[PDB]
Amino acid sequence: ELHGILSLGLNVDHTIVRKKSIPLFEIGNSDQVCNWIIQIIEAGVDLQEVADSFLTMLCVNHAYQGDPNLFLESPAAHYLKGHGIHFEIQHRDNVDHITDLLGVGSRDKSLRKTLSALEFEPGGTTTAGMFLSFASLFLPKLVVGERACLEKVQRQIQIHAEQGLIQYPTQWQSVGHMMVVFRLIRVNFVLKFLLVHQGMHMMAGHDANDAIIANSISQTRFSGLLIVKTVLEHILQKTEAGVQLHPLARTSKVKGELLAFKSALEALASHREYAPFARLLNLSGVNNLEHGLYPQLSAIALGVATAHGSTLAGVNVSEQYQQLREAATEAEKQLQQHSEMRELETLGLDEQERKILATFHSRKNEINIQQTSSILAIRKERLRKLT
Amino acid sequence: ELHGILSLGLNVDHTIVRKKSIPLFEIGNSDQVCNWIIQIIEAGVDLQEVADSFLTMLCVNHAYQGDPNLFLESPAAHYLKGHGIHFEIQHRDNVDHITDLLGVGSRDKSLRKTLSALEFEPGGTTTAGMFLSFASLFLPKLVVGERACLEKVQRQIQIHAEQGLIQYPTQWQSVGHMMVVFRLIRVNFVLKFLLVHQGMHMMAGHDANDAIIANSISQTRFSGLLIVKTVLEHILQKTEAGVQLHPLARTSKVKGELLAFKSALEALASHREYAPFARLLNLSGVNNLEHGLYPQLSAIALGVATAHGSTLAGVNVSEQYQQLREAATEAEKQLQQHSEMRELETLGLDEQERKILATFHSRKNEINIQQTSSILAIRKERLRKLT
Amino acid sequence: ELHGILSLGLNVDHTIVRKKSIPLFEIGNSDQVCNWIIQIIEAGVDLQEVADSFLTMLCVNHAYQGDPNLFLESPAAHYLKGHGIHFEIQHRDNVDHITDLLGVGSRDKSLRKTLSALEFEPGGTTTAGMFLSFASLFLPKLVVGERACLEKVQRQIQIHAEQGLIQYPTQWQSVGHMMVVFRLIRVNFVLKFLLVHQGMHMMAGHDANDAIIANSISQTRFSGLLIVKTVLEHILQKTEAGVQLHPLARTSKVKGELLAFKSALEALASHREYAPFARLLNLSGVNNLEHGLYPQLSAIALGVATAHGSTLAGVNVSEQYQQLREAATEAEKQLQQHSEMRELETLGLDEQERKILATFHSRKNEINIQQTSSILAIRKERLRKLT
Amino acid sequence: VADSFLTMLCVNHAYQGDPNLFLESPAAHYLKGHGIHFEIQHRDNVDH
RNA sequence: UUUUUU
RNA sequence: UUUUUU
RNA sequence: UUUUUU
């Protein structure tokens, strides 16, 4: 097989190509230090190389009440090492200021003077879990962009307020504070991974913050991987016997698209139980799953998927997938109509029952037209906002 | 076999024909030294024989936080040695100036006076990882040339800015700074290999810079090797049973082209998991894969590939592949039309489903004509810019 | 077999009939000495018996950073000895002038006064690797002659400038400097062999100069041995089952030509992995492969090859191969036409597919006529330049 | 060339311009067997 | 003596 | 020498 | 680069 040359360097074995060591502090006033960290986040000051340390401090405070040794024995730390990420316990005796935690060295003097410039206020009420839940609110639609993330965050804040779960400070609702939090989450990997791990792997015991985190992790599944969802749910049909390819996916080019897409999916499934969050966590083979490696397959799959759900009509694409998308949409609409009225007879039903079901199917179809057209109008409003 | 005489000296065994030793420095202020290195890069001063040392210093700072011993035990250093490239740890006690690192010797006095001429500024914010990601931005379309590389770099900077991942200094956006970075990357092998290794082999844990590097490595796959892609995806067709040769590739000359191309591909696949980056890294048997050893096969394969994807219509060729390229393009367009309407009947489908699918295939064909013509017009604009 | 008497003295066993010893110097300022060597090359002064010493010094500086002991343990030195070529390490304590390296003796006083006449300039920027790459530029088309070599050198300098790989001094671009470099390469064997060895056997790690050297070595394959290429690719056809002789090669004389040519090819393949560079390196049985031992076979093979590639129409021959060359060219053109339209039916194809392929084959044939006629016109221009 | 161009006109009239259909036509079947044959030669560009 | 393109 | 899109 | 709803 010389066609293996095309797949060289895609699904490589696991090797560690880095060495990162995040200092974790065994202190007495863990809550007080975490409040200081939240306050420096609120101040807008960027954390240089200490973002990992302080955000992992917040995560350890939330999950383990402030005992970093338990975290070093946790499965999250077990996963992170083996990818080159390690943690040090350093006992701190007295911590009067947040600058005691950061050590002396090059480029830490630059941060230390700024942090000593900030004047904190003692006994802040905001806990680390509150910040972790607020940060988790950003995980859905984070790969989409800043504004979409902020819009989803405001919506989900409303939702969680009307459940009575949480009460975020009104200064967190500001646009700028969300700007700084979005930047902090986007750049930092360990915070996102820890949020994902605690959301996924907590079987019970959720407090308000854990409930919010788990909900946002569940909503973050396959964010940035709509191509995987559309292809695997519609184009690669799943039958009782085997796997049929969609009627619209018979083109000679689309067959090659399918084989390459499969190879990329073997690459993705190597990140077991973390593949849904690959684009969020920027895992290895996520660039192998893109719109542009698979133009025909992407447009056709999204068009076929749009023909079923009225909400997928709001998905935007580049200039070059639009026409093939709606061509596939109308093709699949007509095919679904034909399949609709074709297998009623295959079921044993009276004239009366089939008659009622035909009325129901027509009614459902018009409801779907209502909804798809409404979503299209809302999307047109969104683009008009962009204009 | 006397025909083996033609293949003598092509796929030779692995032997080490060189001895290179890059000094790596175990220092205290690794970040400070790396900032000095980035500043001397920004100054435009060319690094004579120390480019390898300082760029590997930047890579060690990024990957291993500044511990070169871990790098000497890394698999990248394991690969490099055995190709004749070794590293020395030399502990430096005090480093007040960047000139302390470079040792006394012939032709180093020339560089030392220039580096002492430059006046640095303390506490530069730019980290080594930022420079590594910016340098990685150049890897796609680096073998193409300087302007195409710079254009891709600007595009990808825009893309990475709108994700919120990174924020490059505005002085890096200048044309001249990209000129110096392009020159530095083009001449230096170890920097490119280290970027390729960290992009390929990092399974998880990506920060912003690692995400950018991995994305650009994934985009750099088979850059400069479009002939391999076109031939192996279209001319050497892959069936369930065996390997069919394309109908357009039956000529007696093209058969010899195919055998020679195969031999070159056994040469290429010897660089396992690095064959995609052969032209970038200038590996052994990459000159055996060229347009000019395989004129008929190159033109025919690119023409056949252009008949499928609308984006491949933008690929330029020499004066002598153009006519055969479009001849093959029209031949494959007509053949794909005939195959298109020929295997609809081979599938069990109703009159209705086949009718809908024929409408879909026609619609797809006109979309493809739109896109190919647009790409051709854009290419005409590009040549007009050249004029 | 009395016909063995004709082959006596052609494929003889390996014996050493010489004793050459090149002094190699273990010095401190290897780069400084190599710059002096490059400057004496630039001065145009001919090197008497020291050309081998200084050029091997440059090669050792390039490959091994200046440690000749590593070179003496290198496989290139292993190959050279056993052919009668050895090296001495002589440690030099202080080298203020290039004349310190050359020892006192007969005919070295003549060179020493001239080298002391030349006034060097300290700290020359030109490295040994740059000179080695520039010298390697001459290897393709070196056996052809001086002007063709210089033309190829200028073309390849342009090519390597537009890649951004290298920047040769503008004083090297002069015609006279290329004259001196051509003479130096032509006379000297060890320089050419070392360039060939490093180009062939370096699997990875190429810097700019190594990339240039490897490219020119790959382009130098079978330079001066077009007869081997033409015969083995066309006249001695390679089938799945066995070896067919070309229809044009059935003459009773051409059969003897084929047997003698085979014997010469067993002679050539004895130089394993170096047979492609036999005429360049003037290996043992290269005079047994000539135009003049095989007049009929040479002319017929080149004519048959010209019928396939449009570029081989530019190959010149003596007064006496021309008419047989074009006679074979037209014979093979008609035969290829007949074979062309004869095996379309042998493949299972529709009327439509065969029709399209016939259009494609006609279009390809007219493109080939365009290209062959253009090459013929360019060749006519070349002869007019000679006139 | 009178035969060539007039048969070109006849092929254009009867078969819309596809000479292969004419070579499979019964008129061409009759003509050959009387010694009259036709060659398809594809022309790429015809400005004159 | 070699003659092309790479 | 490479030439597209990613 | 991602673009929906959750």
From TrEMBL, chains A, B, C:
Q: Which GO terms describe its biological process?
A: viral RNA genome packaging
Q: What is this protein called?
A: Nucleoprotein
Q: What is its main location?
A: host cell
Could you tell me the keywords of this UniProt record?
A: Capsid protein, Coiled coil, Helical capsid protein, Host cytoplasm, Phosphoprotein, Ribonucleoprotein, RNA-binding, Viral nucleoprotein, Virion
Whole-protein residues included:
20 to 406 of 749
Annotated GO MF terms: RNA binding
Q: Which residues form a coiled coil?
A: 314-344
Taxonomy, superkingdom: Viruses
Q: Which organism is it from?
A: Cuevavirus lloviuense
A Gene Ontology term for the protein's cellular component: host cell cytoplasm
The similarity annotation says:
Belongs to the filoviruses nucleoprotein family.
Q: Please state where this protein is localized.
A: Host cytoplasm; Virion
Q: What is the lineage of its organism?
A: Viruses, Riboviria, Orthornavirae, Negarnaviricota, Haploviricotina
